[PDB]
Design brief:
By secondary structure, this protein is an alpha+beta fold. The chain has one domain (about 1-124): Ribonuclease A-like domain (P-30 Protein, Roll). Helix content is about 20%, strand content about 35%. The protein has 3 helices and 7 strands; from the N terminus they run ααβαββββββ. It has helices at about 5-10, 25-30, 50-55, and strands at about 45, 60-65, 70-75, 80-85, 95-105, 105-110, 115-124. Strands 2-3-6-7 form a 4-stranded antiparallel β-sheet. Strands 1-4-5 form a 3-stranded antiparallel β-sheet, covered by helices on one side. A hairpin with a 4-residue loop joins β6 (about 105-110) and β7 (about 115-124). Its EC number is 4.6.1.18.
């Protein structure tokens, strides 16, 4: 099956653009990355950085994840992110999202060898 690392890339990475450039970004990306296939995923974050820069977070500041696990890491730098959140008019299969662009630190959970991000925990 798809690996956890590959799933993180599909769900969360967008190195092809520097920022969301229109209100339609989330609607397009949530659909194209197959996040709306079985249900409307309610929230999701995309990171507009190189993969290497995001993977490097696993070597940065160790912090507790929101659920208490201790394999989370916070980026030293802020990154360009886009938050996608379901709107009140969303109704499967026509899932609809509000796009919000921001510069925040990211918190990811890391696993494996090579030790790589497998879950997006928060932006702060």
């Amino acid at each position: 099956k798809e690996t956890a690392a590959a799933k993180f890339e599909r769900q969360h990475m967008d190195s092809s653009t520097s920022a969301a450039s229109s209100s339609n970004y989330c609607n397009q990306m949530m659909k194209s990355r197959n996040l709306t296939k079985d249900r409307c995923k309610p929230v999701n974050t995309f990171v507009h950085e190189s993969l290497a820069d995001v993977q490097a977070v696993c070597s940065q500041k160790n912090v507790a994840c929101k659920n208490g696990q201790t394999n989370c890491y916070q980026s030293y730098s802020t990154m360009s992110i886009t938050d996608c959140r379901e709107t009140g008019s969303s109704k499967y299969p026509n899932c609809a999202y509000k796009t919000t662009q921001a510069n925040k630190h990211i918190i990811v959970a890391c696993e494996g060898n090579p030790y790589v991000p497998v879950h997006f925990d928060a932006s702060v």
